[PDB]
């Protein structure tokens, strides 16, 4: 918005200064890992956990915290839900989109995400695995999605996983994949016990951007 | 409570409550009237709410900045006293 161009322009004018001595690092503190409160809070790199009244010199950001979005199928008791999971890397400024894929693959801790090949895309347009973040104007604020192989098949009943509510789960597939891990047959402590949202939660029509009634 | 009269729409059900709140148009009109009257009351009531709010804010301004007057004088005095004690030191 306004911030982005205000600070961009500020940086760009700062770089064209003929006369500047350079900052004194005894006057330019780092950040503290030690502050009150139990939680450990990660902030912007321009920001500190103490009060600093003075505005520090604009720096180019050498580690850009990209966010890459995935679609997961979350099991809730009623049936499957399709929701969103972000993976966040720190990708060096000049890095190549291939390398961004690689960093993204290493950083995900969920078993259900990276199984097949995925393509990075912005507003539905694929990115060249060949070229730099610089060219595509990728910043933290930029919205990056990720698209799997079978994702364009999800409108069918096949690729989309089958919920034991409406579908047979057989000794074929009891031993394979999220079904196996889930332990469909109830145990005393009830197995891994997944989040549940009921059937009448959204009414007769499911969740939408547009009000349908 | 919400008053449920006997001429409200009777629900014939054995699985639940015997009387659904649904109003004869008369009851609706009536309710509207009574509620107009209490509107008359609460108008003045909340009027007094915000009036007292600004009263309290204003008194806070005046007394608090009188306080800051006296207090600053005090701490200026203390600070003078200290730097003197340190010259003596």
């Amino acid at each position: 918005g306004h911030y982005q161009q205000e600070a961009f322009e500020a940086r760009k004018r700062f770089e064209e200064s003929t006369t500047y001595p350079g900052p004194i690092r005894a006057a330019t503190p780092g950040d503290t890992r030690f502050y009150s409160g139990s939680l450990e809070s990660i902030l912007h790199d321009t920001d500190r956990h103490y009060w600093r009244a003075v505005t520090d010199d604009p720096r180019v950001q050498h580690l850009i915290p990209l966010r890459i979005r995935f679609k997961i199928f979350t099991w809730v008791t009623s049936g499957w839900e399709q929701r969103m999971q972000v993976v966040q890397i720190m990708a060096p400024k000049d890095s190549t989109i291939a390398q961004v894929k690689d960093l993204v693959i290493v950083e995900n801790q969920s078993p259900y995400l990276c199984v097949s090949s995925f393509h990075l895309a912005i507003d539905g347009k694929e990115l060249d695995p060949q070229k730099t973040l610089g060219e595509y104007g990728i910043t933290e604020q930029s919205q990056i999605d990720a698209i799997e192989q079978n994702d364009h098949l999800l409108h069918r009943d096949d690729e989309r996983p089958r919920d034991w509510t409406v579908d047979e789960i057989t000794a074929e597939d009891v031993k394979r994949s999220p079904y196996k891990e889930m332990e469909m047959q109830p145990l005393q402590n009830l197995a891994p016990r997944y989040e549940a949202r009921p059937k009448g939660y959204f009414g007769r029509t499911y969740y939408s951007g547009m009000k349908q009634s | 409570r919400q008053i449920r009269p006997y001429y409200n729409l009777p629900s014939k059900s054995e699985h639940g409550r015997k009387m659904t709140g649904f109003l004869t148009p008369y009851r609706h009109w009536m309710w509207k009237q009574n509620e107009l009257w209490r509107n008359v009351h609460e108008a003045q009531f909340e009027h007094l709410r915000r009036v007292y709010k600004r009263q309290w804010l204003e008194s806070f301004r005046v007394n608090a900045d009188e306080y800051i007057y006296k207090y600053n004088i005090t701490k200026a005095a203390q600070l003078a006293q200290w730097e003197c004690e340190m010259k003596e030191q």
Partner: protein, 251 residues
């Protein structure tokens, strides 16, 4: 209710209470539900002022390689009916789908046909809407659509490319909500019009000797009602308006 600050409660990996991510299925009527009211706005824009990529001379051609990094999101209008190459043709005859194009066909160009085109590899989509006849809007001379023969040979088509099963964001219609004035009503007073002399001003309100005819006497409704819609927080119709104003609800 406001959105709470951060989630420290449940592990992130597991993600727990999350509004489902809405995804647009092209096989259902729901697709058109999303896309339609945009199209109309889009066409409206095209009727008033120019927008650059809206009008292409010919079908866009790209290699297989660059297919999915160029096409998706692209929306352009053509003069004739020619269906994009390597696209399986689906006729939309199901009435529920056709239904959402109602406003667009009545108050803008009549919709002759709708087509769902899916690429053979199945990962791309083209929504193709064929309009018949001239706009029911007036068309500006400097406007984009004035460069088209199908408006102002009377058929012409809108083409919209998209990926299947994506959120109703990355079909890009929201860039188009730029709003330009239709200058048709003032065209009367421009120095170009010869009907500007047939105009006469009313400066002063005319003397009136009669009051407005009084509304028919009020009949109080006879059936059971759900109670004050004020106290139930129901907007005046259950339709529109503010709950403070109870107008037009029964009493």
């Amino acid at each position: 209710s406001r959105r709470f600050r951060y989630n420290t409660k449940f592990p992130a990996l597991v993600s727990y209470n999350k509004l489902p991510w809405e995804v647009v299925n092209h096989e259902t009527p729901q697709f058109h539900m999303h896309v339609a009211p945009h199209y109309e706005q889009l066409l409206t824009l095209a009727a008033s002022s120019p927008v650059p990529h809206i009008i292409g001379s010919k079908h866009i051609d790209v290699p297989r390689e660059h297919r999915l990094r160029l096409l998706p999101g692209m929306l352009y209008l053509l003069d004739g009916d020619t269906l994009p190459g390597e696209f399986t043709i689906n006729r939309v005859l199901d009435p529920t789908a056709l239904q959402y194009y109602g406003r667009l066909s009545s108050q803008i160009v009549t919709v002759e046909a709708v087509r769902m085109l899916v690429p053979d590899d199945l990962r791309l989509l083209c929504n193709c809407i064929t309009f018949k006849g001239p706009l029911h809007l007036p068309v500006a001379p400097y406007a984009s659509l004035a460069s088209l023969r199908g408006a102002s040979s009377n058929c012409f088509t809108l083409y919209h490319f998209v990926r299947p099963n994506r959120p109703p964001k990355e079909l890009q219609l929201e860039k188009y909500y730029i709003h330009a004035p239709c200058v048709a009503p003032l065209s009367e007073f421009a120095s170009n019009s010869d009907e500007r002399g047939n105009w006469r001003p009313r400066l002063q309100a005319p003397k009136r000797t009669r009051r407005a005819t009084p509304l028919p006497a009020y009949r109080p409704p006879q059936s059971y009602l759900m109670g004050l819609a004020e106290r139930l927080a129901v907007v005046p119709g259950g339709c529109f308006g503010r709950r403070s104003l109870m107008w037009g609800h029964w009493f």
